[PDB]
């Protein structure tokens, strides 16, 4: 039930106690570095629903990124930027996911869940050997995380006609001149 | 409509017989794997949605739960004997339900099932 | 291209590959279907001789 209560807190995150906690934690994050290691998540309920596991090989990294305009807007989200910076920092791990943890008037703060592919507990667990597979190298760089799908418009409906199957692939498919043998 | 580089984005079809023979070899390989079984799973009879094609019927994705229960084939055992199951579809009509039940009964009457190991 | 021409010029043997396919084109085993299968005939003809239905689709 405790995770349900935490979910309700995160829903009413503008309340007094949550505002105080985010204030203190924002001060702490400003005092720490731009990128740093968490053994335990700040929002365990959010980490658990995103897939964080209490196993040897799962880590959280907390990262602060500059917010604002790039009037040309930077099409990559700050979440994707934080995940990419985490990737260049620890290229050895695999980016499982990411979630917003805090924000300020200059920096926005994210916590990324990362998985170690070379640890045999992760190899054995058949729910995570998929990210152990080599196809998932630098998912943050290829835009394969949740922010990547959201920015790529990987949704069903007439609202996503141009991007449901890949923007560039759809463009190429529509602009190829196919010529059959019997024309 | 040649404003763009159709020169760089023209793709031909000289491999048509090659793809045809490759598809034939692929289905032959599936048959070799499932040597006594049919190559394709049984599929239900469904109706085309739009008004322009109402009077015509085609093949669906999978059989309905109610149709399977009426035909007397368990949900968990139907895919193992080769019956496509679609949980999303609903019957909404006794006519379609009865048609699919008759199809499943014919499949049962024409099917021979081997006793495990 | 330069790679192919280097294989031309080098006195190294050409590594010919055998025609290996992932899936066997014919059934094998001590079962009725494998014993009575005809290699030269196609799938449809073999199923006609066996007496079974090949494709349940239209």
């Amino acid at each position: 039930g405790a995770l349900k209560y935490l979910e309700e807190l995160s829903k009413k995150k503008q309340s007094d106690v949550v505002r105080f906690l985010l204030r203190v934690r924002c001060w702490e994050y400003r005092q720490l570095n731009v990128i740093h290691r968490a053994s335990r998540p700040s929002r365990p309920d959010k980490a658990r629903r995103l897939g964080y596991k209490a196993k040897q090989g799962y880590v959280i990294y907390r990262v602060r990124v500059r917010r604002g305009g790039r009037q040309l807007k930077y099409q990559r989200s700050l979440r994707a930027t934080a995940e990419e910076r985490v990737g260049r920092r620890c290229s050895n791990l695999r980016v499982l996911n990411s979630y917003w943890v805090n924000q300020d008037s200059t920096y926005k703060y994210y916590e990324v869940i990362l998985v170690d592919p070379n640890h045999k507990a992760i190899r054995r667990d058949p729910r995570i050997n998929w990210i152990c597979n080599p196809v998932h190298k630098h998912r943050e760089c290829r835009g394969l995380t949740s922010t990547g799908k959201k920015s790529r418009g990987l949704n069903k409906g007439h609202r996503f006609n141009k991007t449901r199957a890949g923007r560039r692939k759809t463009w190429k498919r529509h602009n190829t001149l196919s010529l059959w043998r019997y024309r | 409509h040649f404003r763009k580089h159709w020169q760089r984005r023209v793709r031909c079809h000289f491999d048509q017989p090659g793809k045809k023979v490759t598809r034939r070899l692929a289905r032959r390989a599936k048959a070799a794997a499932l040597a006594p079984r049919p190559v394709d799973k049984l599929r239900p009879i469904v109706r085309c949605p739009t008004v322009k094609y109402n009077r015509r019927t085609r093949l669906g994705r999978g059989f309905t739960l109610e149709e399977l229960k009426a035909a007397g084939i368990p949900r968990l055992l139907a895919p193992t004997i080769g019956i496509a199951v679609d949980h999303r579809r609903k019957n909404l009509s006794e006519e379609s339900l009865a048609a699919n039940v008759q199809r499943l009964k014919d499949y049962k009457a024409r099917l021979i099932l081997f006793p495990r190991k | 291209r330069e790679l192919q021409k280097r294989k031309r010029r080098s006195s190294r043997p050409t590594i010919r590959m055998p025609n290996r396919r992932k899936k066997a084109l014919n059934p094998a085993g001590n079962n009725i279907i494998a014993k009575s299968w005809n290699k030269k005939e196609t799938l449809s003809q073999n199923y006609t001789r066996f007496g079974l239905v090949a494709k349940l689709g239209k």
Partner: peptide, 21 residues
């Protein structure tokens, strides 16, 4: 493989059959 899938493949395996003409 997972325990659930192992039990499922143990109790409901792929059956070997034929459809008569």
């Amino acid at each position: 493989v997972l325990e659930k899938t192992k039990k499922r493949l143990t109790h409901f395996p792929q059956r070997k059959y034929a459809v008569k003409a």
